Amino acid sequence: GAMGSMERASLIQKAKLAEQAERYEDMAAFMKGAVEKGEELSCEERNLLSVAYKNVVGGQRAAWRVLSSIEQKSNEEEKGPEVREYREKVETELQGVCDTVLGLLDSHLIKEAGDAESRVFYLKMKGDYYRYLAEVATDKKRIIDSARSAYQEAMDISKKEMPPTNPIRLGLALNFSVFHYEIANSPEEAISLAKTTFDEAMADLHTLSEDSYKDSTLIMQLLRDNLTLWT
């Protein structure tokens, strides 16, 4: 890879600089290079990896949605193949990013992750990137089941090994609830999961410091916001 000649520490330093400069494609390339050094990632490094790819794929998803909407309107005056071609171009690039992330998780981040905080983080990421693949899939059943399977494994570990206010556990439950509502056609499961997650976190807030309380309640508010949209 083009980052093979750069020191691991330099790649991490440059990923942080790229984040400050809002250069997320660069940030993702630096973090991919860091992962490919073969060492496990610290908590901060895992978050840099996630931030970088979330921003890259987030721009692709937003663009794909704009183009898919234009395409669907065209299929209700004939303008030729260009809308489909360009939607396909963006779609293929998005799928490539997702495959890259899934490849890093499979070779070899997940298999080396033994602590709950790292293993849950990576399995959640695996669910997330299969979910993004599912958003554009039309194959689709297998992709959905791969997302579900990853989220379910992450949920099982998180419930055994983490308190209900843990921000990773909360963000996992949040994203699995989104999977149920938006991907799996299971709005009742999404609502049930969001409610139970919110309520169990509420009951554990008393154990937290001021700073941890702030971290956990920020994510709980997203569960609440979705429940307001869904009910």
Partner: peptide, 7 residues
Amino acid sequence: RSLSERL
């Protein structure tokens, strides 16, 4: 669209 986890 539903809200997913933030950074």
